[PDB]
């Protein structure tokens, strides 16, 4: 079912160490556990070293703010990869939702067409997010290498590393520098991979829901045409079967949406809290930006990544909302007047249900939508404005 | 024939407006009340413009000038649109008589309760206006200096020298008597009108839940007629609310702006004065302003909530055993009723208590701005 | 009825100093009333001392705002204990609303099951809030004893007491110290108990309403299934009776919600006013925090308690709202297409009615929901950020 | 169709600076193409000169802010003129939408009356906006001529030019001065023409939609009267055709609204972004105002132009929203109880459809309405408050 469609996403998140010991033979079940534990340990060790570094650099506020922004950035994937294992039951329940779908002979072709379209859109989203993460890692490494690693207190050389960190080694000579560079590349890659892979899984769920809704409207039209004449008993049972198919598939979509909503609603609650703190610190940092030096590039990259994650969630939530509202519109937009009273009643009840659009909530404290992205962006820009005015 | 002065709800405001010949009769009193106060407000604004020097006089003037400008604006709208107000009050009287003729204990009790509430609100508003006008006149006495009840400057005219001062004072006092009047009843009228709205709304609710009582169930003709009547009463309530909405809508856009400025002014004034008892007078000013604001917004909000409760009461009826058609009609009634019968501010924003809180917050923000600049 | 279910809460209120002279034998009506009076006196009496303290602490804004925060927190319970006697009539009207429920032979088992579930959840909530109150009291005692009693003007010793109050006695030596400690412990316990008990009664009403709504949906399903199995006279009458039961029970739930809304909406208006002022003062205090000292613990405890009360209220209001919306959704999710004109019309009217969600308002000035808690939290956070940056 | 109604606006766009190689003979395609290229080149040339002028004047903040405000205001037309060509297909699809409308032998008179009213209001709006732009340009020229071209650094004579610009010519003697004067007059005229012409095209689309909605209501009343009696088969067909006409025309209006949102949905986004920036800078400039004849006049004119553009968009968005709501209202307020069953179900479905008002959104981030204008005004006044307080 839905496990097959999202198989590339499942496998990519499994390969980076995102647990999910559910979709392969028992043989691979054992080594994957050790792999995931090792990835967890490495990520946590690097984070702890970063925390030690923050504790050492608490004498000033600029370094403290930069460190705190880095820690929130690298807290996102830790929180995500600790959140999935505890809630793995809900995730597996969601992924197995569409194992047994609806079926009517007349509406099979549209079902297949929109299923294929959903699969293609999911693949496109996965590839785009993977490319974005790869670009982020490469840009981070490049900015690390062009930038002149040094500290101003007098000027003191600093080890040239992508993430400021405290290391028991020299971290500045050949062996230590090489090991630190490789380890930090691995860190960056795995952190971005885990976070963006879980996010893309959520967005792929939403994409499948939206495409199923589009199929529902596209068959809404010929269904109502089916009911039109008056009708012999056989055509009457045909209309009954078509209405049954439509209603059952709509309820299936609602079930999928509710499951996704609860699970990644808790997920987004945590995500957006962390994002709010990070964006406050980033507004303060941007207040310090002058010229087109490397500092500006780093600040702009941090802001771009944070707002990009928020925008991904918001755009797919908006897609779901607009798809439900358009289900209402397409329920109205057919030739019900020529139909029968049963079909007309079915149309009225569908419109009643579609009055309110499906949405995903962050633990009921908000709804993910381009309105939420607009609100966060407005808050960021306003806070930056008052910060510059104060300075 | 039901008359405007016959209906208790609108009787007080109708009498007050007919005394000045605003809405019921035309005579010299209308102009004697309008033109002198308009000239007073104009010279008040000129003095406000010329009083940029010291902030205390500036603020007290500005407050009085805005108050009197709003009063004159309300009065000009009232006289300009006298016919529509007369028609609205005549319809109110007719509907009041119709409702009073109903033979339902609860409907009659609701009628009397709301009628007494409206009348008490009107008389309380008039009394508060009288007292606050008295405070207006006595305000310049505690300061000690040769002040005026309201600032006013005539081009090249000395107001603090020669006996001329006194005359101004005296005439100003009489200019207060129309002013307060021109302001107060409309507020009350709005309240009163809105209250009747609620009455009407609530009446239908009862008639929605008891429409099947004493009506034979077997014959669908009489049930159909009764539901048709319920629909007609709902449409009548909608029309009433829409008309009141337009009138008080333009008036309330101007009122929202002026009230924001006035509350700012009073809050800033209360925090600067250092006289013995003038702070109590400023506090009375604030009480008056927020009382009017609360009356407006609270009554509009109740109109909305009672329309939605009209929807709810449409649901809570004897609709299970009725034929299919009557159930469809009640479904349509529930469909329409779920939209609040909003009274909008300038036709841009529905009038609710949310906008009341927003107005208070904006006034406090203005007050903080004035505090910062003055310091 | 609903008084048997709510009995432990009623008994806690009666024994802790509420004027609940309704639900026992006429005998202890006499002493209890007297007892109640004493509690009031004592509360107000201690308040007196606190008040006068504020008068002499009006020298610097620091102790002035600390005293103001204490005064508002301890104003809460006095306001609630004086509010209940004034509005006792409506409280008893609500408590007696559910004395005569409807009944249908087929939906009796579900009614019993969901009534039991409601009672269990009410007891769970009562125990949780009692535990939270006891935890707060013991935390106050511990914070008082570990911290060092001293006032800086030069350092001057001050009595070691839970809260700074004026006592005509020495209040520093043994006897005054013990008397003051006992009185303060009694004061704390009684105030928190009365306030949280009234809040828990409100939330228990909301829980009962939500569980009745859940019962309504759970029977909405088999109701439509009954209608589907076109219909003979007996079947038509059975479907009619089932629809009657459903509609009457829904109207009963609406009645309960309206009564609760009136009473505790006035209560919530007052509550939220007080909490807004308290949160402003607490944000100002939080801007003064440095380190992880005891002062930070006290400020965090105040914030946690205030936001916990606001939360509890918003949690249960949002539960009611979402339960009504879910009633709409579950009205959609039955087999109405296979039903009858009567049952389909019943579904249509139920959905149209559910287009508006039940909610509790704070005297129409707002609606209690998770959105309200989010707004309060955001307001306090933004005010704190503004104050700290402006400094 | 809709092109014939809007021909004056289409020609105003076409002949001034606005491409649109679609609605004239092949002969004018090539000369008009070259003319558009020349207009774009001249506008971009003057824009670049303004930018380079801004570059040297970056030492101070006042001159930099004034230059930035001018740069953004003249950014608006450049964005508009390079935005229409890329989206030419969607704009041409918005037009030619009403080429084949519905028709009934009974509702033709109202259709013609409301079509005429829509055309009249379109011409009225076009003339009003043209007069506004002419007033703006003449006011600009007047203020430049009465203004003193003196720069304070020492006092230096700035060239008495209408828009500050760095010109390779002398720009002081007669030749360069007059060349620059006519060039800048042409720039202003063309920029305002292009911007306001596309804005007026959007508003004209909205006016057409609103007038069609009014027609739908005005025939909804007699439509229900027609349905009301018990109907012979011929009357059944007549009422069926009336329902079909009403539903088809409403769907056509919905199609027009969606097309208008698609064509002009992201131009609003860019316009509001550029506005926001301009309003921020103008709030600062107003904070610099001290009641001077020219400075205050210039700031007030800039604010008036920006707020007027936003106000026009919001006015017509609110018109569409209120028109849809009024569609629901007028659907209810008629004699739908005596109508046949089909007409009653038609009213039910229309009322369900009209629950939500048609709106135009800035790419789903916001909706153009008087609420948006109120929010913009509140934001600008609040930022001015902050600027004055932070002095
Ligand atoms: C001008 C005025 C207005 C309202 C109340 C009193 C008064 O003197």
Author numbering:
A (entry chain B), C (entry chain C), D (entry chain A): 7 to 159, 168 to 243, 313 to 474
B (entry chain D): 1 to 375
Task: Please share excerpts from the published article on this structure.
Most insects, including human-targeting mosquitoes, detect odors through odorant-activated ion channel complexes consisting of a divergent odorant-binding subunit (OR) and a conserved co-receptor subunit (Orco). As a basis for understanding how odorants activate these heteromeric receptors, we report here cryo-EM structures of two different heteromeric odorant receptor complexes containing ORs from disease-vector mosquitos Aedes aegypti or Anopheles gambiae. We determined the structure of a heteromeric complex formed by ORs from these species in complex with a Apocrypta bakeri fig wasp Orco that is amenable to structural determination. We find that these complexes form asymmetric tetramers containing 1 OR and 3 Orco subunits, where activation of the sole OR subunit upon ligand binding suffices to open the ion conduction pathway.
We first focused on the conserved OR10 receptor family, which detects indole and derivatives in various mosquito species. We corroborated the functionality of the AaOR10/Orco complexes by heterologously expressing these complexes in cultured HEK293 cells and performing voltage-clamp electrophysiology to measure their response to indole and o-cresol, canonical odorants known to activate AaOR10 heteromers. We therefore determined the cryo-EM structure of the AaOR10/Orco complex bound to o-cresol to an overall resolution of 2.9 Å. The OR10 S7b helix shifts diagonally outwards from the main channel axis, increasing the distance to the opposing Orco subunit from 6.2 Å to 9.7 Å. A conformational change in the OR subunit alone is sufficient to open the pore of the AaOR10/Orco complex. Therefore, the presence of the OR subunit is sufficient to impart odorant specificity to the complex and lead to channel opening without any concerted movement of the other subunits. Mutation of these residues to alanine decreases the apparent affinity of o-cresol activation, seen as a right-shift in the dose-response curve assessed using an established calcium flux functional assay. In the o-cresol bound structure, density corresponding to the hypothetical lipid is absent. In summary, by destabilizing the inactive conformation and stabilizing the active conformation, o-cresol shifts the receptor conformational equilibrium towards the active state, resulting in pore opening.
